[PDB]
A and B are shown apart, each in its own frame.
With several copies, the nearest count.
Chain A
Amino acid sequence: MAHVAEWKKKEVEELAKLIKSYPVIALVDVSSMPAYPLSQMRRLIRENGGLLRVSRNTLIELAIKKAAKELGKPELEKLVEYIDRGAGILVTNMNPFKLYKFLQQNRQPQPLEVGLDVLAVYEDGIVYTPDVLAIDEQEYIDMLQKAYMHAFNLAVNIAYPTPETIEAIIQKAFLNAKTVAIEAGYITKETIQDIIGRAFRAMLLLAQQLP
């Protein structure tokens, strides 16, 4: 049915129910995609729990669905309706972060690549901007390892003993005692060899004063 309308609150009516049907509502930029590549993107989105709709002003009407319920996803109490020219609306059960990654990694469809750029994503009271959605995975991995090391270092240093820390605690206390004893030149079975090494090197250096 495309001989004519284009009808308002037949198209916006349908889009209405649609937005109310899915937990995750994104605005995407479709302008970079030729018709067939976009068609392939639509198929992919369908196979992954969602769908894409293209329209213009009747898309603005995130308002009628927001009104028909309780939120702040619309025009009204929202931010800066991230809509642009040739924005489409993509409704999905995919988590907003998953959606963003999905769209980034599926430019499908010679080595030219094109896709859908996310403008903003609404879920349960919050609008997610691309800067929030764009996760630095290595940063999270690094921070996780840093936090683990902080806990390990703290526990060892205070001698809080756990299977993870007990051997390092024993070795640290021993190394502390051995290092202090060698520095003080105090003779034990455990320190005599490093001490003789110091004394031998002192002899070697001292001998260097001879002509």
Chain B
Amino acid sequence: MEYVYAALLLHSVGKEINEENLKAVLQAAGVEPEEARIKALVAALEGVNIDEVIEKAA
């Protein structure tokens, strides 16, 4: 979830959810993030329209 919050933070400020941006945010949070957790998230977020998911949240 720490990974997910990092992603949505990026999205909320208009920054691309990629491996590098995710890593920096997480390290600023004071954690050493697992790299495989980071790429799994980026991959899963592919094809996912975050805004449409957010707004049409059933």
A140 to chain B, nearest CB (A): 4
8 Å CB contacts to A: which residues of B18-58?
35-37, 39-41, 43-46, 48, 50, 53-58
Residues on A lying within 8 angstroms of B by beta carbon are 95-98, 101, 124-126, 128, 132, 135, 137, 140-141, 143-167, 169-171, 173-181, 183-193, 195-207, 209-211
Nearest neighbor of A149 in chain B, beta-carbon distance? B57
Q: Is the interface of A mostly helix, strand, loop or mixed?
A: helix
A176-B54, A197-B54, A206-B8 are known contacts. Are A155 and B1 too (CB-CB below 8 A)? yes
How far, in Å, is B20 (CB) from chain A's closest CB? Answer: 14
B26 to chain A, nearest CB (A): 13
Note all chain B residues with C-beta closer than 8 A to A170. Answer: 4, 8, 48, 50, 53-54
Of all A-B residue pairs in the complex, the 4 with the closest CB atoms, nearest first, are A161-B44, A97-B43, A159-B1, A197-B57
Assembled-state Cα–Cα distance A201/B54 (Å)? 8
- CB-CB nearest in chain B for A135: B44
| A145 in contact with B40 (CB, 8 Å) | no
